[PDB]
CSV table of C-alpha atoms in Angstrom, one decimal:
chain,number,residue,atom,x,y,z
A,911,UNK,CA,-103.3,-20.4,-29.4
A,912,UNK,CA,-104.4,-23.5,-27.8
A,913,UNK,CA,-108.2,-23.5,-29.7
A,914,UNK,CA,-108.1,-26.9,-31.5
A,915,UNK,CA,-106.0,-30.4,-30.8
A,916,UNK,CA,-104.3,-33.1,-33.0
A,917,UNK,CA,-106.0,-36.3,-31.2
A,918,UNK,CA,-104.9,-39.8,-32.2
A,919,UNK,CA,-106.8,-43.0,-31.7
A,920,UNK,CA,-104.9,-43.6,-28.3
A,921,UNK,CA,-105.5,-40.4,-26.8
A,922,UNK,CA,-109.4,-40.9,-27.8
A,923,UNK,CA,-110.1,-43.5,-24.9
A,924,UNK,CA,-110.2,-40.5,-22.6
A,925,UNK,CA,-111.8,-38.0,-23.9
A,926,UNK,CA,-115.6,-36.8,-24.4
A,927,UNK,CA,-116.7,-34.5,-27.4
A,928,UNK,CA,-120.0,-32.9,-27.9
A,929,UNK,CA,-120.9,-33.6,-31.9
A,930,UNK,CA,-122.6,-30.5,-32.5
A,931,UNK,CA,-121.7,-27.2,-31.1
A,932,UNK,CA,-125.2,-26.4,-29.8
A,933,UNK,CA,-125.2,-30.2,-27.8
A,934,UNK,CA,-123.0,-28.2,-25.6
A,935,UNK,CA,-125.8,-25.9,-24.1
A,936,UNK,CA,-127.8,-27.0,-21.2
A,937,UNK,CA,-137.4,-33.7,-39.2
A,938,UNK,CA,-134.9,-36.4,-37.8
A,939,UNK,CA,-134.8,-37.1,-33.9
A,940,UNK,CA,-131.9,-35.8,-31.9
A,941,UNK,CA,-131.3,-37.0,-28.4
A,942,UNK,CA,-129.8,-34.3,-26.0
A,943,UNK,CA,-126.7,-36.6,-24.4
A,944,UNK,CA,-126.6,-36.6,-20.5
A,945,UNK,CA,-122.8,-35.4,-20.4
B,458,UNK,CA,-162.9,-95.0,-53.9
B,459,UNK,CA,-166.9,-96.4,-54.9
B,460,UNK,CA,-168.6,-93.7,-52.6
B,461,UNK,CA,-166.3,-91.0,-53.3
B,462,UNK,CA,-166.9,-91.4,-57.3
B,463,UNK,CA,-170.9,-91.9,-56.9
B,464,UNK,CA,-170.9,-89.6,-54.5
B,465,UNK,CA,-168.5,-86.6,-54.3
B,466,UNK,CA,-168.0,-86.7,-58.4
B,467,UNK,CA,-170.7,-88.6,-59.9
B,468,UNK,CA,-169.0,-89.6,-63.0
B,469,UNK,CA,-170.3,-91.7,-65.9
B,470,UNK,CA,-169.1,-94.6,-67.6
B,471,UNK,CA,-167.5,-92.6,-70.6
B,472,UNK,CA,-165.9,-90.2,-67.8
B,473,UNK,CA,-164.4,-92.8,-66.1
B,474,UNK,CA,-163.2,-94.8,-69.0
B,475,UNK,CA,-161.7,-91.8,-70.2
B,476,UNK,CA,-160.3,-90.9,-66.8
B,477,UNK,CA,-158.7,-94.4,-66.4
B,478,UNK,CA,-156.9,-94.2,-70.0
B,479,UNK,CA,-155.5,-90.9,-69.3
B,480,UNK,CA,-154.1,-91.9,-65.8
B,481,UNK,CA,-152.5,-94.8,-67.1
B,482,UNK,CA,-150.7,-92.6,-70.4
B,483,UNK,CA,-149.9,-89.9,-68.5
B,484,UNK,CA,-147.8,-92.4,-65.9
B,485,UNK,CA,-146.3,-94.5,-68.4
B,486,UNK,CA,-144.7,-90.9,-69.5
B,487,UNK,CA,-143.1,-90.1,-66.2
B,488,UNK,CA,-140.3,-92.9,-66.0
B,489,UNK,CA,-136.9,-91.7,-66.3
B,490,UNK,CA,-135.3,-92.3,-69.9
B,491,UNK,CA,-132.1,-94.9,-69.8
B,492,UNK,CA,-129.0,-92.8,-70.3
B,493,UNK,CA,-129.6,-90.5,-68.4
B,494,UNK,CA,-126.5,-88.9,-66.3
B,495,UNK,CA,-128.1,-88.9,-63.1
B,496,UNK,CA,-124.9,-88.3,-61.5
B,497,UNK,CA,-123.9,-85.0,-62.3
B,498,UNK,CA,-127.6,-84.0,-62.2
B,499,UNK,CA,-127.5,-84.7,-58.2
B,500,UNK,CA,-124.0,-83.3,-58.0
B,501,UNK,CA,-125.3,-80.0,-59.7
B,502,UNK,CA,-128.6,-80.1,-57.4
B,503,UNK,CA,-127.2,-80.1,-54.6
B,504,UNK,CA,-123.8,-77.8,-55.0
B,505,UNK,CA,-126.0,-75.2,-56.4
B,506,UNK,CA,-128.0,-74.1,-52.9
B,507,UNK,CA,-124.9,-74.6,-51.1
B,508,UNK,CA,-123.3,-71.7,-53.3
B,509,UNK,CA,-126.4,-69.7,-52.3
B,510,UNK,CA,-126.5,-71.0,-48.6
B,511,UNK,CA,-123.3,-69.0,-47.7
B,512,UNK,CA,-125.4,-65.8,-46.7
B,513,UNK,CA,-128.0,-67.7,-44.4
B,514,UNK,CA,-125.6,-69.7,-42.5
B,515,UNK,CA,-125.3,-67.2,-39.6
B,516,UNK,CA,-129.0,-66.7,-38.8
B,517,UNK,CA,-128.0,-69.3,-36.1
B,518,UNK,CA,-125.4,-66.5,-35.0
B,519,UNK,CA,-127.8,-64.7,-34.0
B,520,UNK,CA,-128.7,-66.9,-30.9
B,521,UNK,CA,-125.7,-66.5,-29.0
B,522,UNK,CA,-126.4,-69.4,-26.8
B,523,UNK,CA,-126.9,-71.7,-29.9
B,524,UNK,CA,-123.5,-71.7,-30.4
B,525,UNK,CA,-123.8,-75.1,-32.7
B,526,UNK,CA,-121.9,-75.7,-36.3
B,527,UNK,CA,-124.2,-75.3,-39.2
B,528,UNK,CA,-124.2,-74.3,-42.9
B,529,UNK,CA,-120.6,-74.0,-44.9
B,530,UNK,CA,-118.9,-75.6,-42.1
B,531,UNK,CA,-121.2,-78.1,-41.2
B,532,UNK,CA,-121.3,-79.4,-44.4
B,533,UNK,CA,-117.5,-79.3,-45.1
B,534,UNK,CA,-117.4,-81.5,-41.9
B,535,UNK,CA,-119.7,-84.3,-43.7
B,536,UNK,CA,-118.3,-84.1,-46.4
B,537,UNK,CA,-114.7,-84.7,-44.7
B,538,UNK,CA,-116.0,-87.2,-42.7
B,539,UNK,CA,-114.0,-85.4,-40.1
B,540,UNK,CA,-112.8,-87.7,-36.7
B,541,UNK,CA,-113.1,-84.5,-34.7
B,542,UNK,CA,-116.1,-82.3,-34.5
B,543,UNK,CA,-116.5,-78.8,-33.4
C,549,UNK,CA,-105.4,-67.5,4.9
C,550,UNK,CA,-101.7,-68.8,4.7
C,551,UNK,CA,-99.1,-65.8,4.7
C,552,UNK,CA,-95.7,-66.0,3.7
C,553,UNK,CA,-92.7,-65.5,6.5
C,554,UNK,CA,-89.5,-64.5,5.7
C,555,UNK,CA,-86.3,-65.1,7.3
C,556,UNK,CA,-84.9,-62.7,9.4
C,557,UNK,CA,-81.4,-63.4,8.2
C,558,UNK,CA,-81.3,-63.1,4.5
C,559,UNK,CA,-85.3,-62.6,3.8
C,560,UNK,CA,-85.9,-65.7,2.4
C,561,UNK,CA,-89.2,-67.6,2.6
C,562,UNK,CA,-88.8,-69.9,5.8
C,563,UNK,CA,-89.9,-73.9,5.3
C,564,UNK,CA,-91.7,-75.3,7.6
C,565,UNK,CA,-90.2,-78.5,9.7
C,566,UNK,CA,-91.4,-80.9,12.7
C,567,UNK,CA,-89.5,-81.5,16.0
C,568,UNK,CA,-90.7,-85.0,17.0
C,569,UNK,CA,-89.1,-85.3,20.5
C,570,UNK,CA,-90.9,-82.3,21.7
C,571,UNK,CA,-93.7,-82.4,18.6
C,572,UNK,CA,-93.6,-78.7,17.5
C,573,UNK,CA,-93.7,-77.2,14.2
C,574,UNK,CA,-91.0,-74.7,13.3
C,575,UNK,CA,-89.9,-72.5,10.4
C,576,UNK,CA,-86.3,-73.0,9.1
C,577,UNK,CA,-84.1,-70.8,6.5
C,578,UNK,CA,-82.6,-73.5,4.3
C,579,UNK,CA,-79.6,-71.2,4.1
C,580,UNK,CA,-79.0,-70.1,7.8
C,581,UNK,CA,-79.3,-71.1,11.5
C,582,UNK,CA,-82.2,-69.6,12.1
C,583,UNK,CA,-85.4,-71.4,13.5
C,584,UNK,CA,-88.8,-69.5,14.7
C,585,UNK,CA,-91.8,-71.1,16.6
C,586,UNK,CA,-94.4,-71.8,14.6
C,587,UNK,CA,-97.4,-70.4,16.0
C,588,UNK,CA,-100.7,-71.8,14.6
C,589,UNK,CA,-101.2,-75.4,12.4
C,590,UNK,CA,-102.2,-73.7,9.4
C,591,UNK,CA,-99.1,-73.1,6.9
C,592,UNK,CA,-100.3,-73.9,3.4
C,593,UNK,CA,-103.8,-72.6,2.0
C,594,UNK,CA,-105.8,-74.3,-1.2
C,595,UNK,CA,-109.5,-72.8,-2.1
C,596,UNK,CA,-110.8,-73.9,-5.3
C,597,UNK,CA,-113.5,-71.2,-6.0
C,598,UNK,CA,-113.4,-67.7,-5.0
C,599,UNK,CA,-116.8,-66.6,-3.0
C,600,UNK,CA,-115.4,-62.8,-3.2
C,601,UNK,CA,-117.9,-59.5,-3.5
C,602,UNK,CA,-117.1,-57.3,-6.4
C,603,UNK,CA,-114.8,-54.5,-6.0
C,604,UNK,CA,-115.2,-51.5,-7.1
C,605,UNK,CA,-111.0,-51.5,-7.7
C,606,UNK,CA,-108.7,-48.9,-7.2
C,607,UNK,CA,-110.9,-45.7,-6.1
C,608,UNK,CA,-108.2,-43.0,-5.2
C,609,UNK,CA,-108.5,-39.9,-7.2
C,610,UNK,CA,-111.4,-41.2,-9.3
C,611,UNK,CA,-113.8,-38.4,-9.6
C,612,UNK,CA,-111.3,-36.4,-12.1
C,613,UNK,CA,-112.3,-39.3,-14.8
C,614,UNK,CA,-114.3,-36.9,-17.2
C,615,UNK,CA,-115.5,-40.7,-19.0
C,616,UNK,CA,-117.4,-41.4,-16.0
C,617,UNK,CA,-120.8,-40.8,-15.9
C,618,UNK,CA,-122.8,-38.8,-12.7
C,619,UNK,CA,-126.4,-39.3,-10.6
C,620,UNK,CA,-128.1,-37.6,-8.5
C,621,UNK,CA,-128.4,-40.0,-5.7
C,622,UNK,CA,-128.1,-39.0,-1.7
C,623,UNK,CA,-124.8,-39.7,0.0
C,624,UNK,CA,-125.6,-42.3,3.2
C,625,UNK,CA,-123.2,-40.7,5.5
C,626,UNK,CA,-122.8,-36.8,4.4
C,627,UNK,CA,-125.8,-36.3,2.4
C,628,UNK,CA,-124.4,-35.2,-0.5
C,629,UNK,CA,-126.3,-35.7,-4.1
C,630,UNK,CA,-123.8,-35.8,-6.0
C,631,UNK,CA,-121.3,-38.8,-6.5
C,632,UNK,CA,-119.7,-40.7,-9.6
C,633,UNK,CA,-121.6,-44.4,-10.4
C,634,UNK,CA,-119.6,-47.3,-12.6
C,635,UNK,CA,-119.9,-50.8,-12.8
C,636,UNK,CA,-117.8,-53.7,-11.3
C,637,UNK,CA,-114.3,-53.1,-12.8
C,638,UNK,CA,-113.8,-57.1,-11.9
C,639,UNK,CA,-113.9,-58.7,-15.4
C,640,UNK,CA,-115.8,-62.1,-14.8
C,641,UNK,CA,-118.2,-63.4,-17.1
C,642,UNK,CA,-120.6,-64.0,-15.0
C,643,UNK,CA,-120.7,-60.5,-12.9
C,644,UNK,CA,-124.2,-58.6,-12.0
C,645,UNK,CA,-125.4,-55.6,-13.3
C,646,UNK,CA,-125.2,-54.3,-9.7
C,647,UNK,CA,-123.8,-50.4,-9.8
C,648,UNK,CA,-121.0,-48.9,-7.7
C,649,UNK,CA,-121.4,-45.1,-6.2
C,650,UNK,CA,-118.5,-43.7,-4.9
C,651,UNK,CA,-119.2,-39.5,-3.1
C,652,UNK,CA,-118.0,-36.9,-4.4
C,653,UNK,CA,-117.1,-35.3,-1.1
C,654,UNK,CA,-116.8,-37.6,1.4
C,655,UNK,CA,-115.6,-40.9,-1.1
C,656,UNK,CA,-117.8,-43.2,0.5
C,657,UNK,CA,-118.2,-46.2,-1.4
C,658,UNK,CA,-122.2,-48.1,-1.1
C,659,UNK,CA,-123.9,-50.0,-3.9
C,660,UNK,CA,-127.6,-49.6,-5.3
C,661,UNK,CA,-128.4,-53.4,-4.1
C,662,UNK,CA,-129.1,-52.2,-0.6
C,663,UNK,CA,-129.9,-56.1,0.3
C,664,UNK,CA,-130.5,-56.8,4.1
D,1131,UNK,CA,-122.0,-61.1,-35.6
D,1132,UNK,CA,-125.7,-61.7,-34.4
D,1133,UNK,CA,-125.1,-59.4,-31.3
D,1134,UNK,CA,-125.6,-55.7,-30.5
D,1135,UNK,CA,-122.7,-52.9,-31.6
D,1136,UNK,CA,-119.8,-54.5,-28.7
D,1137,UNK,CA,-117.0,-52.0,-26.9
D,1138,UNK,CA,-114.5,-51.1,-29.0
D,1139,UNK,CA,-113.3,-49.0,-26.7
D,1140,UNK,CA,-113.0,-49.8,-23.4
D,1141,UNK,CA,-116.4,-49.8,-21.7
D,1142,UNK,CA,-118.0,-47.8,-24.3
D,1143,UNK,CA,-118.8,-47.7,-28.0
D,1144,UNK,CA,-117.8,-44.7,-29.0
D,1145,UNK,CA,-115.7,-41.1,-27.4
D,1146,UNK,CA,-119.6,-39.3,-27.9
D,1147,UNK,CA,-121.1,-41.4,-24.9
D,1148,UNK,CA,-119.9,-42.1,-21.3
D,1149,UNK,CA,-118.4,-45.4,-19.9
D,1150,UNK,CA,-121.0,-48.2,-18.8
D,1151,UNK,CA,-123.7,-47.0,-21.5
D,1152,UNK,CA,-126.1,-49.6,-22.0
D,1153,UNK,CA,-129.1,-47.6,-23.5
D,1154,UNK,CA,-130.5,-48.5,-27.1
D,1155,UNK,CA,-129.1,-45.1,-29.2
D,1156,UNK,CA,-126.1,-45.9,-27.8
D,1157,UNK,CA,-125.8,-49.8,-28.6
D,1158,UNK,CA,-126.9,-49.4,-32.5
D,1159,UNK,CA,-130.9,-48.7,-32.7
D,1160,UNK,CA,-131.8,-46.7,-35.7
D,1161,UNK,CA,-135.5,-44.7,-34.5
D,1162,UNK,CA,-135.2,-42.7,-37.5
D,1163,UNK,CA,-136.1,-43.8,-41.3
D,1164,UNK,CA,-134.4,-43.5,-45.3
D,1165,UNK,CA,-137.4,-40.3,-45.4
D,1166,UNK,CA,-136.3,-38.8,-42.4
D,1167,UNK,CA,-132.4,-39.3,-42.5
D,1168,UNK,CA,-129.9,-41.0,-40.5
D,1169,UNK,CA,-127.8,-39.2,-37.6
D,1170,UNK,CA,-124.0,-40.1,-37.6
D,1171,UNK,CA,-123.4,-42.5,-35.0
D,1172,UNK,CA,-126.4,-44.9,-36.3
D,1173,UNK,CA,-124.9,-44.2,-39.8
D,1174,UNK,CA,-121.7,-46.1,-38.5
D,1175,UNK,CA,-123.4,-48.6,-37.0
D,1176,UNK,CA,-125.8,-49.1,-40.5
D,1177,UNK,CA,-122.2,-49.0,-42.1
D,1178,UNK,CA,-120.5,-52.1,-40.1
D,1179,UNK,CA,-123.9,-54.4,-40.0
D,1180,UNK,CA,-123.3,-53.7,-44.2
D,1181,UNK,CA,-119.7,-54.3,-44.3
D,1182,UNK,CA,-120.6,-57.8,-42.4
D,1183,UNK,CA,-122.6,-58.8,-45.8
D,1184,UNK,CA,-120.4,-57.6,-48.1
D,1185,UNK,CA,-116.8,-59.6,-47.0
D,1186,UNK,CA,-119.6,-62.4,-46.8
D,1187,UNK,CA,-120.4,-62.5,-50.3
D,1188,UNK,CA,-116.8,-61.7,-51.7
D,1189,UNK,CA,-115.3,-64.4,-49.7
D,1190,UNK,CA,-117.7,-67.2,-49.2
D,1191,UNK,CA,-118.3,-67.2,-53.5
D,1192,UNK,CA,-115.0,-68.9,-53.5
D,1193,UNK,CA,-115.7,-71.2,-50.6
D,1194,UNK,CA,-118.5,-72.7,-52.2
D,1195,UNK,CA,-116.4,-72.7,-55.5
D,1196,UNK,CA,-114.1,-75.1,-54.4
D,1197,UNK,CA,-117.0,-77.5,-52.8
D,1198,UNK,CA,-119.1,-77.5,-55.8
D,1199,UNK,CA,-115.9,-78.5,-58.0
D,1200,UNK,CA,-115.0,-81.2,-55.4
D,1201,UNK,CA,-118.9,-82.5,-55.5
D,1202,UNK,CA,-119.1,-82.8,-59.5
D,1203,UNK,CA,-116.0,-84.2,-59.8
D,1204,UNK,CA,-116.5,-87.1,-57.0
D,1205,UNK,CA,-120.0,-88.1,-59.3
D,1206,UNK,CA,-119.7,-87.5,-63.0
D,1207,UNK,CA,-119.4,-90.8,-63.7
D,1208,UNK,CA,-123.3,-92.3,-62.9
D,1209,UNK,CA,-125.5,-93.1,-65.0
D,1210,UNK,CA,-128.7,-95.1,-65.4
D,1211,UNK,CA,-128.5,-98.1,-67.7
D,1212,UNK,CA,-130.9,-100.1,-70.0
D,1213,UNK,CA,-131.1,-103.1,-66.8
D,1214,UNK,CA,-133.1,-99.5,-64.3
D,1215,UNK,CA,-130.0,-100.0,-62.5
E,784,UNK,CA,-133.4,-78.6,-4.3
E,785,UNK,CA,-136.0,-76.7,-5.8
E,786,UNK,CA,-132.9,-74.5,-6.7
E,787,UNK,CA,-131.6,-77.1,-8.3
E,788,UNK,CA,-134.6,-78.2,-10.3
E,789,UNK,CA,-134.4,-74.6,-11.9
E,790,UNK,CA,-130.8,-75.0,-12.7
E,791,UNK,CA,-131.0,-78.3,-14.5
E,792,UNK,CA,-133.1,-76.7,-17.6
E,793,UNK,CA,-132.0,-75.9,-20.8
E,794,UNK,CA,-132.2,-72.7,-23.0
E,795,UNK,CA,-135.7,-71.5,-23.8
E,796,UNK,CA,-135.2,-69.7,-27.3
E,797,UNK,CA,-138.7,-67.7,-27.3
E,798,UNK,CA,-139.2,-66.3,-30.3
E,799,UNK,CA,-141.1,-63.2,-31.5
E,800,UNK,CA,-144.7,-63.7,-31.7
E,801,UNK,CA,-146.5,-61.9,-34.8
E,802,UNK,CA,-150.0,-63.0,-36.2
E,803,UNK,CA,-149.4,-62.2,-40.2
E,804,UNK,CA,-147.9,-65.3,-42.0
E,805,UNK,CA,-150.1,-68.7,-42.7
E,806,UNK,CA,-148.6,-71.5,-42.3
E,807,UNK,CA,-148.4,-74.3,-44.6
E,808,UNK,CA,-148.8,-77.1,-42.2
E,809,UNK,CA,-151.3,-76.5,-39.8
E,810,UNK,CA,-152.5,-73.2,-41.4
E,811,UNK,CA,-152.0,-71.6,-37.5
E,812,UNK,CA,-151.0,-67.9,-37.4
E,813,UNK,CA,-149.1,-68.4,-34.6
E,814,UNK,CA,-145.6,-68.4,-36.8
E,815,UNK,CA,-142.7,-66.7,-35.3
E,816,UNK,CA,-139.9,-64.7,-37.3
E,817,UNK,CA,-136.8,-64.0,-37.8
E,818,UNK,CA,-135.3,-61.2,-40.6
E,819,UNK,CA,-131.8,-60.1,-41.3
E,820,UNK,CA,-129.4,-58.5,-44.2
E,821,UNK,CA,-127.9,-61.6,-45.2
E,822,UNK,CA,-128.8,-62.5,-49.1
E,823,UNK,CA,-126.4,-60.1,-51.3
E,824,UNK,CA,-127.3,-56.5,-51.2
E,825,UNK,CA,-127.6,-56.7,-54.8
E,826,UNK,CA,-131.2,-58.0,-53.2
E,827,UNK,CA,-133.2,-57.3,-50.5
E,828,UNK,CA,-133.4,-58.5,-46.5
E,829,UNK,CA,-134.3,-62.2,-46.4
E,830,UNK,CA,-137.1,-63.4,-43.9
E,831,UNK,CA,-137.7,-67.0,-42.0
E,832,UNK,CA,-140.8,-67.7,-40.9
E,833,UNK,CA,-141.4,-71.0,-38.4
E,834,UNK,CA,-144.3,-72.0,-37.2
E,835,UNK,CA,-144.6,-72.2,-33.4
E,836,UNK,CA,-147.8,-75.1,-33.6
E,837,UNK,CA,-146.1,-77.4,-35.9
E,838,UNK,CA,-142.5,-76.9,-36.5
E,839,UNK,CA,-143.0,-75.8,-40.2
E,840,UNK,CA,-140.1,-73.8,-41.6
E,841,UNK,CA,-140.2,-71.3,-45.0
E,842,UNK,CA,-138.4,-68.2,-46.8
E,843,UNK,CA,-139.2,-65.0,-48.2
E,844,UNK,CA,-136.9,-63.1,-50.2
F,240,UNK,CA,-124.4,-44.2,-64.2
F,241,UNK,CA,-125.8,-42.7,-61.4
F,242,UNK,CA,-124.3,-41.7,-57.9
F,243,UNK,CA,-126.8,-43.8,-55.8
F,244,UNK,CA,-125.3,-47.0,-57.3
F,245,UNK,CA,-127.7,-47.6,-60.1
F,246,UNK,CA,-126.4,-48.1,-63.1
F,247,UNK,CA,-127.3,-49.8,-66.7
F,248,UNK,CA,-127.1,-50.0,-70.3
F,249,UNK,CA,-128.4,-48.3,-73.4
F,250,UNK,CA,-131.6,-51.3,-74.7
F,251,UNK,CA,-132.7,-49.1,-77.3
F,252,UNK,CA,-133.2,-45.4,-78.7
F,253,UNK,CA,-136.2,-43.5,-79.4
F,254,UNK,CA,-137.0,-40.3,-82.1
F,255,UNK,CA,-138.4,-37.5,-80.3
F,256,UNK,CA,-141.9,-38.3,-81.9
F,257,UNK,CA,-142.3,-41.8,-80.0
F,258,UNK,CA,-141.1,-39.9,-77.1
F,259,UNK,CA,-143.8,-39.3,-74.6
F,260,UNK,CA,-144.5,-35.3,-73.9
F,261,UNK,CA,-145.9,-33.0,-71.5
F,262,UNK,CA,-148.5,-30.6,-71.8
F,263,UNK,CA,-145.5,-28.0,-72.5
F,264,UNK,CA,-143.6,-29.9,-74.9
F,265,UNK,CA,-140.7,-31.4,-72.8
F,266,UNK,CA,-139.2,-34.6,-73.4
F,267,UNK,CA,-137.2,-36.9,-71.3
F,268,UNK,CA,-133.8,-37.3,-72.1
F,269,UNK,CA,-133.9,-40.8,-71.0
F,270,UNK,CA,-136.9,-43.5,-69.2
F,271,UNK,CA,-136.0,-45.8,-66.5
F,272,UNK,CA,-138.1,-48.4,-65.4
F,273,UNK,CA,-139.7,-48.0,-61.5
F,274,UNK,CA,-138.9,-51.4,-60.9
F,275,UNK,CA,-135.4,-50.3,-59.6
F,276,UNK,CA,-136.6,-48.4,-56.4
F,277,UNK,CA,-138.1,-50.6,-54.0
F,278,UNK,CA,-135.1,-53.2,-53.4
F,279,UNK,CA,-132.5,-50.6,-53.2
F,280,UNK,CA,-134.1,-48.2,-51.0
F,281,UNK,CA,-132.4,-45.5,-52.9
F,282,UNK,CA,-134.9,-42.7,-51.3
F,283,UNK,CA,-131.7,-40.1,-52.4
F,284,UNK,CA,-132.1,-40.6,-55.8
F,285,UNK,CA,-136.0,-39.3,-55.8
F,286,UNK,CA,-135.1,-36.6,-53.4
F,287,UNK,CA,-132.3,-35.5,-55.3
F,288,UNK,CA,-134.6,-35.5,-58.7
């Protein structure tokens, strides 16, 4: 259905993921990533 | 020294006849006994730290710029008595 | 900036040669009769070190690069704010830190060193 | 090696971060602490700078095995005599 | 020329300046560090202190 | 063993009467020595205790 993708380690070098779900949205110390 | 026994110790005669005998046994104990193996004494003093010296060898890697052979290396070269250093 | 010329004839590099009695350079094919007038001294080029500006490199179709990261910097020319930023793609050792923005409309190309 | 986490990838350290990153999180700066816990990309980077040590050790015991052997064998035979020589 | 001048100088390694260990030489605080993971981790990190007056050298472990 | 990487042997064995107790009468199974905990940094092992 096209909802999750079989990456190598070729492939990787242009691509971006978001770690956690909720870094997607506009204790320890979490950094919200510019992307 | 004269002043510095009169005046920073201020010991008698007994003190410093006892002081002199006591210097004089105590170096007549310290010379090394004949049959000794020195040799394998050094050898063991000094290939022990090199064993150990292993793990420090690349604070130098951590100045980039100080790119200069030192440690394990440095001492196989001497050792070697290599013609062509690094 | 010496530029090769090829022969009309079978488009082979033309040699250069010397015509004493009238004292004229000319370019020969070694293969064929054909001879053009040379028309400036300079035929062969040799620079040592390269005084060049970094280049940004190729540029065409570079904003679809979802690896590249963004700013919020005004465009020069079509005062747009928002643009695509890298550094030099030229891979000397001893390059500058100086940045590369390249529009997101208009693909103007301008640098953050804005040196007089 | 004595230098910050390098590119591994190609102008980058790892997919999470965009090309020409040159901040601290993203070049191998743990902010956090053992009491606090350790977010996954430092954890790597924790990981490698202990992997460095560890070949270190379980290699360079041998090195210095061979030059110890060499150094007691070129020596064993010195001694100090009756003469002080 | 004055270009030059600069050019013709040698690596500066400035170290980090702290004001915790004695020295042994000159007994002047001034001793810079340096501290890494390089002993086994059987043990912990191993520290070199040098002294930035007098050239003294040490190690903690 | 345990799973933080500290591990040892057995130096001797105790009756439950030279075993120090608690105000409610527990015993430990075994005693480790404290000395253990700086070097390693093994934080996980006291949080997971």
């Amino acid at each position: 259905e096209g909802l999750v993708e079989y990456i190598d380690a070729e492939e990787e070098e242009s691509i971006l993921i978001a770690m956690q779900p909720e870094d997607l949205e506009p204790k320890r110390i979490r950094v919200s990533h510019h992307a | 020294a004269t002043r510095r026994v009169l005046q920073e110790y201020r010991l008698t005669k007994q003190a410093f006849d006892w002081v002199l005998s006591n210097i004089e046994a105590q170096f007549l104990r310290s010379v090394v006994h004949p049959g000794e193996m020195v040799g394998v004494l050094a050898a063991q003093s000094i290939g022990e730290p090199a064993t150990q010296m292993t793990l420090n060898t690349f604070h130098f890697a951590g100045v980039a710029s100080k790119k200069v052979t030192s440690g394990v290396p440095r001492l196989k070269e001497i050792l070697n008595v290599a013609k062509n250093m690094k | 900036m010496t530029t090769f010329r090829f022969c009309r004839d079978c488009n082979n590099m033309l040699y250069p040669r010397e015509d004493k009695e009238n004292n004229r350079l000319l370019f020969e094919c070694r293969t064929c009769s054909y001879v053009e007038e040379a028309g400036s001294p300079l035929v062969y080029r040799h620079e040592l070190i390269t005084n060049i500006g970094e280049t940004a490199g190729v540029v065409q179709d570079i904003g679809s690069d979802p690896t590249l990261p963004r700013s919020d910097r005004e465009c020069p020319k079509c005062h747009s704010r928002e643009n695509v930023f890298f550094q030099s793609q030229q891979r000397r050792k001893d390059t500058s830190m100086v940045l590369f923005f390249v529009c997101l409309s208009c693909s103007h190309i301008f640098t953050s060193d804005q040196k007089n | 090696e004595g230098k910050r986490i390098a590119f591994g990838f190609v102008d980058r350290t790892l997919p999470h971060f965009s090309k020409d990153d040159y901040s601290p999180e993203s070049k191998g700066f743990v902010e956090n602490s053992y009491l606090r816990g350790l977010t996954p990309q430092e954890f790597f980077f924790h990981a490698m700078g202990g992997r460095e040590g560890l070949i270190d050790t379980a290699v360079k015991t041998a090195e210095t095995g061979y030059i110890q052997r060499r150094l007691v064998k070129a020596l064993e035979d010195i001694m100090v005599h009756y003469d002080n020589t | 020329a004055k270009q030059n001048l600069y050019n013709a100088q040698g690596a500066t390694i400035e170290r980090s300046v702290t004001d915790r260990f004695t020295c042994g030489k000159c007994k002047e605080k001034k001793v810079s560090y340096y501290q890494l993971q390089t002993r086994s981790a059987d043990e912990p990190l191993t520290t070199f202190c040098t002294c930035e007056a007098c050239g003294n050298r040490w190690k903690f472990s | 063993a345990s799973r933080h990487g500290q591990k040892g042997t057995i130096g001797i064995t105790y009756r439950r009467e030279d075993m120090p107790f608690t105000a409610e009468g527990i015993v430990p199974d075994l005693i480790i020595n404290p000395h253990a905990i700086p070097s390693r940094m093994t934080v996980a092992h006291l949080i997971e205790c």
